[PDB]
Amino acid sequence: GAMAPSYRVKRMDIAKNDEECVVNAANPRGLPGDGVCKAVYKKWPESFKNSATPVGTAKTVMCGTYPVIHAVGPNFSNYTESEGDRELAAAYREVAKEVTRLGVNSVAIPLLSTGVYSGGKDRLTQSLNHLFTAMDSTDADVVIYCRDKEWEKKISEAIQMRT
Ligand SMILES: CC1=NN(c2ccccc2)C(=O)C1
Ligand SMILES: [Cl-]
Ligand SMILES: [Cl-]
Numbered sequence: 258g259a260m261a262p263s264y265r266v267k268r269m270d271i272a273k274n275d276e277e278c279v280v281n282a283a284n285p286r287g288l289p290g291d292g293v294c295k296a297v298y299k300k301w302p303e304s305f306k307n308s309a310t311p312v313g314t315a316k317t318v319m320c321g322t323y324p325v326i327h328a329v330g331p332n333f334s335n336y337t338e339s340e341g342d343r344e345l346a347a348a349y350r351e352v353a354k355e356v357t358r359l360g361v362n363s364v365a366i367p368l369l370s371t372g373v374y375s376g377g378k379d380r381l382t383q384s385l386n387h388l389f390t391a392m393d394s395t396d397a398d399v400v401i402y403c404r405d406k407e408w409e410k411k412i413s414e415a416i417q418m419r420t
Pocket of ligand 2: 269270273
């Protein structure tokens, strides 16, 4: 574990992370996809060998020795708010089991089911709170990646408000 496990947020491409593993915002089919998934595909394409996995699950594939945890959040265009909420919580719980299993001291993570899978709604608080519920029991350093200046500020405020 990390000596003093922490949460941090950075506004930059998760493909440039400084952590021991990365969480992909994957599609269920293991396709290159869009947004974070496409950035992950360019940096670690070898990790998309047999990465297909159902909604609400995570599947780790090694790129060399670097673990890529493919986490499948729901696309809120297809799910009810209720069922989508359940699957989004579940995907983060599966990320926490994989981070623990791998024995990493740090993990790079995006906010699942924001952007293209958001169903046109602001889900920063919903996705971040499910991330916290899953990762709070882990002792890895968690570095949350985002691309929007206002989301960076709101994620930073949410981390500090619990400290
Ligand atoms: C920046 C981001 N804005 N959003 C977003 C999406 C729909 C409505 C409002 C906000 C994201 O998912 C990431
Ligand atoms: Cl960047
Ligand atoms: Cl963002």
